[PDB]
Amino acid sequence: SNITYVKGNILKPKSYARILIHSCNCNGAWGGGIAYQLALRYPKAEKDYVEVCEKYGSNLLGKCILLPSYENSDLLICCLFTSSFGGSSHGEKQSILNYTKLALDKLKTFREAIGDYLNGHIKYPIGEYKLEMPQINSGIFGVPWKETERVLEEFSGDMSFTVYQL
Ligand SMILES: Nc1ncnc2c1ncn2[C@@H]1O[C@H](COP(=O)(O)OP(=O)(O)OC[C@H]2O[C@@H](O)[C@H](O)[C@@H]2O)[C@@H](O)[C@H]1O
Known part of the structure; x- marks a missing residue:
């Protein structure tokens, strides 16, 4: 009931200011899925995310960081650090869910x-x-x-x- 579902692509521009939340690995790799789409559009945000991963690595698990998109002052990016590695090496489900909760609490x-x-x-x-x-x-x-x-x-x-569904 605190969730509003909308149909469509979250990267279609919106007139209002918003934070785009997404789930990230700690390995500095916006390598697939929505993270890769953010890397294409917001390369300076990707640079910040990579820098934080290089400094802290998996010590970030359960934390989040808020980044400018830089390309649009109405868009910030919130990275939830919920897995050490991306792709098929991602963490187990209960780990990811626990870190998602901890990161959102921050x-x-x-x-x-x-x-x-x-x-x-x-x-x-x-x-x-x-x-x-x-x-x-x-x-x-x-x-x-x-x-x-x-x-x-x-x-x-x-x-x-607001949760987007393709
Ligand atoms: N523009 C988009 N707009 C709305 N929904 C989208 C969009 N792109 C993807 N989705 C949906 O969001 C779901 C989650 O996207 P994923 O990228 O697969 O995210 P996640 O399951 O949280 O895995 C995170 C992992 O993949 C990378 O994003 C990231 O580097 C991290 O390692 C996808 O299954 C897909 O259905």
Whole structure:
């Protein structure tokens, strides 16, 4: 009930400010799926994500980082670090779900008051950005969407999400 589902591609431009949340590996590889689509469009954000992975590696698990898209001041990117490696070496389902919860809790705390790269690029107060995501964990990471959906619903009354379905 804190989730609104919309049909369509999350990368089609929107008039309002938003944070695009997606699930990431800690290996500096936006290599497939939605992450690769972000790498094509937002190469400076990919650079930041790679830099954070190179510095902290899997110590990032259960954390998130907020990045400018740089190309559109109405679009930030929120990377949830939920697996050490991408592709077929991704972590087990319970690991990914636990880290998804922990990473979203850090996003929740940050909005209430992760944001190193926002300095000098964030146009609005962070609370003014809508929270949007594809069906994270359900593609390359192989987690049935209903299990991630239950994680999102743990934040009812704290955060609301718009989830895109192709
Ligand atoms: N523009 C898009 N718009 C809306 N939905 C999309 C889009 N692109 C993909 N999707 C949907 O989002 C689902 C999740 O996409 P994945 O990229 O497979 O994400 P995930 O399962 O969370 O795996 C994360 C892993 O893959 C890479 O994205 C990332 O580098 C990480 O290692 C996909 O199954 C797909 O159905």
